[PDB]
Design a protein around this ligand. Structure first.
Ligand SMILES: CCCCCCCCCCCCCCCCCC(=O)OC[C@H](COP(=O)([O-])OCC(O)COP(=O)([O-])OC[C@@H](COC(=O)CCCCCCCCCCCCCCCCC)OC(=O)CCCCCCCCCCCCCCCCC)OC(=O)CCCCCCCCCCCCCCCCC
Ligand SMILES: CCCCCCCCCCCCCCCCCC(=O)OC[C@H](COP(=O)([O-])OCC[N+](C)(C)C)OC(=O)CCCCCCCCCCCCCCCCC
Ligand SMILES: CCCCCCCCCCCCCCCCCC(=O)OC[C@H](COP(=O)([O-])OCC[N+](C)(C)C)OC(=O)CCCCCCCCCCCCCCCCC
Ligand SMILES: CCCCCCCCCCCCCCCCCCCC(=O)O[C@H](COC(=O)CCCCCCCCCCCCCC)COP(=O)(O)OCCN
Ligand SMILES: CCCCCCCCCCCCCCCCCCCC(=O)O[C@H](COC(=O)CCCCCCCCCCCCCC)COP(=O)(O)OCCN
Ligand code: HEC
Ligand code: HEM
Ligand code: HEM
Ligand SMILES: CCCCCCCCCCCCO[C@@H]1O[C@H](CO)[C@@H](O[C@H]2O[C@H](CO)[C@@H](O)[C@H](O)[C@H]2O)[C@H](O)[C@H]1O
Ligand SMILES: CCCCCCCCCCCCO[C@@H]1O[C@H](CO)[C@@H](O[C@H]2O[C@H](CO)[C@@H](O)[C@H](O)[C@H]2O)[C@H](O)[C@H]1O
Ligand code: FES
Lengths: 71, 167, 85, 54, 244, 124, 383, 55, 55
């Protein structure tokens, strides 16, 4: 299996845990907000792209070198 | 002292030496841009099979724009060509000078007069006939009759294998 | 305003004696270590402010501008961005 | 040192001949040296290192 | 601009070719060609690469001739001026999957897959961007992202919605050298191969650069000695002034 | 700018008690930081000389002053190319920084400016 | 009499490169002139060589550049050398101009070489702009489009002039073929003006870092400055080598490896880095014509330095306040460069306007005031 | 897929043959030259064309 | 040189421009070879290969 799958999971639970939590919280809020009616006629619809970017940037910092070492 | 001067001339000399070696490298690498580029060198050297070609047939391979006649000559064809006394030939050559292998007449298939492509098997010497001004080539592709001055040019060709020639 | 050798346009020179020695007689790198350390330090110290002050000021301006710009284009900076445009 | 100066340096014609001959030697030997060094630092990576499989 | 509009910046991966003195790994180049040929070439051309370009980089003369000879190319018309085909030669360019842009877009829901011959130079990031993009499709788009139809979420792509779906999955290729073909491994190999395709002079260029660095450095050192030697009578000059 | 201008403005400042109280200390510090004395120059050695007026003023210097100026310029050029500063007696002390050239250039300019005025006179 | 002096042709070379009397104290910033001559020689050699392999037709241009990279022997080197030396040419020209401004090289009696120099700088900009179009990648096309459309601002005839320049109704084949012909020409014109500014300079000779006469103490150009020039030549060649062989694309835009497409507009259309400060000045003025005028004025205002510098002393070596002002002017010019490539977004819009005001106020207000006050401080301070 | 359109003023007058090979096949090996420059490409110009056609 | 040879040069400039005009406008191809209006063909050799007249 893809070595990246395990490395990414390890980095998310470990050095990038704070970022993982923020992304998780964001998704919870957005999904709940989409569930509520008259969401389609709202002015501002929040995404979680920012939080996702912060998490992925972090995972990449902790993984890039490790991954290429096992290829 | 001589040692004192010699040291400073060693430094000057080393500098002149590296400047000479650097200039040579620079000039050689830079000017090489004018030598045939990789795409041009790829368009030279056409390789052709010989297994496909039956006896008593003439192929036409394009090579550097020009057509190449490749005939797989039979025994009796070779004989016919080796007969004509070299003496009576505008361009005096025997087949042995033309071919490096008697069974493979390889020629540049443009007529030596003005530059039409001779229609093969036709003629009066039953080789090739240029329809343009009526010049007749032989089975060696030697000029026999008509305005053409020379025999049909031979490219530079080698048999890499016995079944493939490169031109 | 410039002549040529022999008539360069100097006021008359008198009373200066100049002396020097051959390149072959001299050590070209005499005092190089002292120069490289102490002379360079002196020259650099005396010019340092003229580089530090403008560089540090304009780097600070840039840093503030780029950080604000970055913040305006986040979620948090939505409202301030709306006003700014 | 006198001898060396007198033979290779004193006459500029001889000095330039020595410089050019040295440049020729340098060029040939430096080429060989770099080729070997390049092949060692990039060992197992180059076509010449995997060519034998094919 | 929002970070999403820019696209996430790829990590810096330690490529074999990173390094002033480092060539490509040619075994990785060969494996990357096999990924190109079996996966990417369905939608992407490599039009600037000829079969002869593979020779002595990834393949022998015979292997590359065999690849060329399996294809048919347009010949010159026959003697009646009718169209003809011929087998490929080493001089021929690798043929693309589509005859024109219109056909390419029709097969890809309107999107045009770019030619990949310069893609490593035509994108910020180079090999890192190609690797990040191919391996960076999340299973689910971040909550709140609305993808246009026929778009796939990929954070590395500017705007996030790319018309190319994920294509590398564990074992889509069976490498001929026995290497486990994981998503990561295939992305690494194909990114290396595409980097080579963009800059095939890379290995020679860096070796010539090493020679230049050495010679130029020596010349610089000597030029300092010679300048100081020549200038010393001026630097050392002394004066005595007796006012007239 | 003309030396005349500079000298007149300076004299307006030196007259005003308030102005001199604030300007003279600044000017002295400026001169200290300028650092021309550390190459053995006097202030007037720095004035641009490639002008008809300045060439005429320099030709009117007494021979002694002229020979000494040549030596200061040569000496400063040697410090500049060597990246050294003057030491000891080569440093110009404040009391040696005399305006040897200012009176000559002021006379040359006085005539030049009077000539310009008189070239524009209108008989009344 | 020595042949080098007697023969009129040899004597011209002699006067410029051998017996030429130089100040004995030129520092390393006097070496940019010979570096600029070196860049000009490299650009001529590599440029003429590229012309032997390049095709100016829009259907073939981009591919001819790929053929140079891929098939021509050492084509990659010649192309990278040409593209990187264009950047080095601007680094050296900014250094040479910065030297000239700091040391007062524009003052009498050197107003003429300085004024011809300003035209050399305009010719270099035009040369480099046209050469960049020749690749016919995305940045080539879209840069040509936006820069050539600035001419539309000329009142009454502007649109007509643009169509005349393009040879059609948009940037296309006619534009590319004329840019090739003019790009080949302009370096020769540039060499003539470079020669003219040296002949103009020869009447006064080189200035020197102290700002005083060097008529008292001259050195022959050769061997002293010949050997001192070799140091910076080799330092330059080391920088050249690092870019050309190890990072040949660092100074470029990846979008120029995508073929020109009049339909797709690139994310951000920016000039090459060396034109960025002038682009920031243009953006600062909201009016189209206003912005073009400001941008041209930013270069032509160099012509007034001989007037607005009121100092009785040449150059900044002994002027602490002028040295501070010059430092701020230079750093502001670099910040304008950076602002030329940011997005038109807050807060960079206002910052660009403030930096543009600072740029012009240096010439129009600050240098005239500071140079006036320093005159008074030198006089009072040395009494 | 390929398509045809009707001609416009900008179009060139189309020739009788698709390629040289077709042209030669229809003319017993000879290739009839394009006539756009023939008056400049032969000594004689109009006189040669007239003399040839009537001679 | 000026004004004497400036004005004497104008005479031959205008004489030259008259000769120029007669060739360029009335006989533009008199000094050329008709074969240069046939596109280069490496196969067909022209009847006679000569340099331009001045060589
Ligand atoms: C691009 C192509 C490559 C070619 C390279 C050419 C560049 C060479 C050049 O012109 O600069 C070298 C140049 C050395 O030239 P130099 O002839 O020894 O002295 C020139 C200065 O006028 C002499 O200035 P100074 O004697 O007052 O010395 C000042 C210098 C010290 O200069 C030293 O070298 C020591 O130090 C600094 O100014 C550093 C600023 C402090 C930062 C903290 O370096 C500088 O002094 C740069 C100062 C600029 C700020
Ligand atoms: C780039 C071309 C480099 C050519 C190198 C060939 C030898 C010339 C050289 O390095 O200078 C030596 C010579 C002489 O250097 P030199 O002038 O110091 O030597 C004279 C004194 N003797 C002969 C006693 C050593 O340079 C020239 O003759 C000019 C050629 C410049 C290169
Ligand atoms: C960045 C800001 C640089 C400011 C320089 C201030 C002076 C300084 O410390 O420099 C060291 C030196 C100081 O040299 P100096 O000649 O004044 O002093 C030598 C030493 N004394 C005083 C004892 C005689 O300055 C230079 O050499 C300045 C050259 C200017 C080049 C600028 C390039 C910028 C390009 C943009 C163009 C538009
Ligand atoms: C025009 C551009 C000028 C800049 C030159 C930089 C190097 C270009 C040459 C190519 C190169 O990399 O040469 C290397 C050696 O370096 C070297 O030895 C070259 C460095 C020396 C730089 C300066 C020397 C002269 C430059 C200009 C002089 C011009 C006069 C005549 C052309 C490789 O070596 P290789 O294996 O490729 O070499 C073949 C013979 N072995
Ligand atoms: C690669 C480029 C550099 C290679 C040339 C350097 C010369 C090589 C060594 C030869 C040498 O040192 O001898 C001197 C020749 O230098 C000379 O005669 C030239 C001196 C310096 C060489 C180039 C000058 C550069 C100045 C301007 C740069 C221009 C860049 C623009 C393209 C003569 O020594 P001597 O003459 O001192 O007397 C000494 C008594 N005979
Ligand atoms: C069946 C379709 C398909 C396959 C398989 C495919 N691609 Fe693509 N690819 C596309 C399309 C469509 C685009 C254009 C996407 C867009 O612009 O929205 C694209 C875009 C790209 C881009 C550029 C994205 C950008 O920045 O513009 C790269 C790099 C890329 N592909 C590489 C690959 C590689 C490497 C492979 C396989 C090893 C691959 N592709 C497989 C359809 C494909
Ligand atoms: C001051 C001198 C010159 C400068 C500053 C200059 C600048 C440039 C620049 C910036 C480019 C774009 C390079 C790229 O990114 O690929 C270029 C391309 C080109 N230049 Fe020049 N150039 C100069 C002299 C010349 C000369 C004398 C020629 C002679 C023909 C020439 C021929 C070319 C050609 C053919 C190209 C297009 C091929 C390519 O991009 O490399 N240049 N030039
Ligand atoms: C192709 C571009 C150029 C070349 C090859 C060039 C070359 C030179 C050279 C060799 C010198 C004498 C040595 C030196 O001081 O460095 C010089 C001096 C000078 N140049 Fe340039 N130059 C160029 C562009 C410019 C520009 C753009 C300007 C002005 C805007 C300029 C203004 C001057 C001035 C004023 C001097 C005299 C400086 C002094 O010695 O005090 N030059 N140039
Ligand atoms: C003023 C000049 C006077 C006349 C001088 C004539 C110079 C013109 C000759 C061009 C010579 C090129 O000759 C050829 O050069 C290239 C380098 O360029 C060499 O090529 C060699 O080094 C290069 C890099 O430098 C590698 O890419 C290559 O794999 C290797 O074989 C060939 O080994 C040599 O055969
Ligand atoms: C820098 C590139 C190298 C090539 C040199 C440039 C070529 C064109 C330069 C010629 C232009 C005329 O340039 C002019 O020539 C004459 C003699 O040559 C010089 O005259 C100078 O030297 C000679 C002797 O060396 C003296 O008689 C004269 O008193 C002095 O002024 C001028 O100072 C110079 O301005
Ligand atoms: S052309 Fe062949 S016979 Fe005249």
């Amino acid at each position: 299996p893809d070595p990246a799958i395990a490395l990414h999971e390890a980095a998310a639970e470990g050095p990038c845990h704070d970022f993982k939590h923020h992304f998780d919280e964001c998704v919870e809020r957005v999904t709940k907000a989409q569930e509520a009616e008259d969401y389609d006629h709202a002015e501002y619809k929040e995404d979680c792209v920012e939080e996702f970017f912060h998490l992925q940037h972090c995972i990449n910092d902790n993984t890039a070198d490790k991954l290429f070492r096992v290829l | 002292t001589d040692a004192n001067r010699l040291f400073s001339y060693f430094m000057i000399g080393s500098f002149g030496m590296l400047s000479a070696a650097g200039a040579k490298a620079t000039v050689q690498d830079f000017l090489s841009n004018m030598s045939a580029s990789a795409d041009v060198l790829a368009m030279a050297k056409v390789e052709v099979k010989l297994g496909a070609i039956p006896l008593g047939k003439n192929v036409i391979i394009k090579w550097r724009g020009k057509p190449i006649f490749i005939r797989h000559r039979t025994s009796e064809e070779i004989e016919e060509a080796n007969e004509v006394n070299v003496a009576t030939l505008r361009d005096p050559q025997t087949d042995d000078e033309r071919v490096q292998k008697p069974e493979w007449l390889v020629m540049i298939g443009v007529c030596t007069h003005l530059g039409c492509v001779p229609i093969g098997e036709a003629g009066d010497f039953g080789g090739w006939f240029c329809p343009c001004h009526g010049s007749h080539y032989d089975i060696s592709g030697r000029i026999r009759r008509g305005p053409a001055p020379l025999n049909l040019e031979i490219p530079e060709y080698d048999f890499a294998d016995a079944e493939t020639l490169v031109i | 305003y410039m002549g040529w050798w022999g008539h360069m346009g100097s006021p008359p020179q008198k009373g200066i004696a100049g002396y020097t020695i051959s390149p072959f007689a001299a050590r070209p790198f005499a005092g190089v270590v002292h120069a490289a350390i102490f002379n360079t330090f002196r020259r650099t110290k005396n010019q340092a402010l003229f580089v530090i002050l403008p560089v540090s000021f304009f780097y600070y301006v840039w840093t503030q501008a780029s950080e604000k710009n970055e913040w305006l284009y986040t979620k948090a900076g939505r409202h301030e961005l709306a006003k700014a445009l | 040192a006198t001898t060396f100066y007198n033979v290779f340096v004193k006459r500029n014609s001889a000095f330039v001949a020595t410089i050019l001959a040295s440049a020729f030697v340098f060029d040939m030997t430096f080429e060989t040296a770099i080729d070997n060094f390049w092949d060692r630092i990039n060992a197992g990576k180059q076509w010449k290192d995997i060519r034998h499989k094919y | 601009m929002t970070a999403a509009e820019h696209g996430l910046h790829p990590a810096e991966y330690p490529w074999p070719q990173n390094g002033m003195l480092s060539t490509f790994d040619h075994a990785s180049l060969r494996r990357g060609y096999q990924v190109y040929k079996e996966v990417c070439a369905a939608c992407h051309s490599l039009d600037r690469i000829a079969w002869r370009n593979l020779v002595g980089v990834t393949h022998t003369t015979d292997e590359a001739k065999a690849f060329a000879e399996e294809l048919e190319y347009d010949d010159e018309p026959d003697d009646e001026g009718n169209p003809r085909k011929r087998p490929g030669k080493l001089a021929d360019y690798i043929p693309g999957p589509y005859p024109n842009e219109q056909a390419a877009r029709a097969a890809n829901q309107g999107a045009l897959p770019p030619d990949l011959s310069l893609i490593a130079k035509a994108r910020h990031g180079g090999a890192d961007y190609i690797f990040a993009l191919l391996t960076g499709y999340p299973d689910e788009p971040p909550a709140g992202v609305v993808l246009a139809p026929g778009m796939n979420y990929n954070p590395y792509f500017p705007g996030g919605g790319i018309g190319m779906a994920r294509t590398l999955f564990d074992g889509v290729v069976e490498y001929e050298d026995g290497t486990p073909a994981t998503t990561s491994q295939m992305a690494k190999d194909v990114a290396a191969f595409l980097t080579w395709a963009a800059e095939p002079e890379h290995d020679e260029r860096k070796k010539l650069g090493l020679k230049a660095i050495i010679v130029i450095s020596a010349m610089l050192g000597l030029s300092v000695y010679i300048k100081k030697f020549k200038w010393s009578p001026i630097k050392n000059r002394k004066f005595i002034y007796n006012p007239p | 700018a003309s030396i005349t201008s500079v000298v007149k403005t300076s004299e307006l400042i030196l007259k005003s008690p308030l102005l001199s109280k604030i300007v003279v200390p600044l000017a002295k510090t400026y001169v200290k930081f300028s650092g021309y004395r550390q190459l053995g120059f006097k202030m007037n050695d720095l004035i641009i000389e490639e002008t008809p007026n300045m060439q005429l003023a320099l030709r009117r210097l007494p021979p002694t002053e002229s020979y000494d100026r040549v030596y200061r310029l040569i000496r400063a050029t040697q410090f500049s190319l060597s990246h050294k500063l003057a030491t000891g007696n080569d440093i110009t002390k404040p009391e040696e920084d005399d305006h040897y050239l200012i009176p000559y250039i002021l006379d040359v300019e006085a005539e030049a400016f009077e000539k310009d005025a008189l070239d524009n006179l209108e008989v009344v | 009499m020595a042949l080098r002096k007697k023969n009129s042709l040899l004597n011209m070379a002699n006067s410029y490169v051998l017996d030429s009397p130089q100040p004995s104290n030129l520092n390393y910033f006097w070496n940019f002139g010979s570096l600029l001559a070196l860049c000009l020689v490299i650009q001529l050699a590599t440029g003429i060589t590229l012309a032997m392999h390049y095709t100016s037709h829009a259907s073939l241009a981009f591919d001819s550049v790929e053929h140079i990279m891929r098939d021509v022997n050492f084509g990659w080197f010649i192309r990278y050398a040409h593209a990187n030396t264009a950047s080095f040419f601007f680094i050296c020209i900014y250094a040479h101009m910065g030297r000239n401004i700091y040391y007062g090289s524009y003052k009498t009696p050197r107003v003429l070489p300085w004024s011809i120099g300003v035209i050399i700088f305009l010719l270099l900009i035009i040369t480099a702009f046209m050469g960049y179009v020749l690749v016919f990648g995305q940045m080539s096309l879209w840069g040509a489009t936006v820069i050539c459309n600035l001419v539309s601002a000329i009142p009454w005839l502007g649109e007509d002039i643009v169509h005349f320049l393009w040879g059609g109704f948009s940037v296309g084949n006619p534009t590319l073929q004329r840019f090739f012909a003019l790009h080949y020409l302009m370096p020769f014109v540039l060499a003539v003006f470079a020669l003219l500014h040296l002949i103009a300079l020869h009447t006064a000779g080189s200035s020197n870092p102290l700002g005083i006469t060097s008529n008292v103490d001259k050195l022959s150009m050769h061997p002293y400055y010949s050997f001192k020039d070799l140091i910076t030549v080799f330092a330059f060649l080391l920088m050249f080598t690092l870019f050309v062989f190890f990072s040949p694309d660092k100074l470029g835009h990846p979008d120029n490896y995508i073929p020109a497409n009049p339909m797709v507009t690139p994310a951000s259309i920016v000039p090459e880095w060396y034109l960025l400060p002038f682009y920031a000045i243009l953006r600062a003025i909201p009016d189209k014509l206003g912005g073009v005028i400001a941008m041209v004025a930013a270069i032509l205002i160099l012509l007034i330095l001989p007037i607005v510098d009121r100092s009785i002393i040449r150059g900044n070596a002994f002027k602490p306040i002028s040295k501070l002002l010059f430092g701020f002017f230079i750093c502001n010019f670099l910040l304008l460069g950076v602002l030329g490539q940011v997005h038109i977004e807050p807060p960079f819009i206002v910052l660009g306007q403030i930096c543009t005001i600072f740029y012009f106020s240096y010439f129009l207000i600050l240098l005239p005031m500071v140079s006036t006050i320093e005159n008074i401080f030198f006089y009072i301070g040395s009494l």
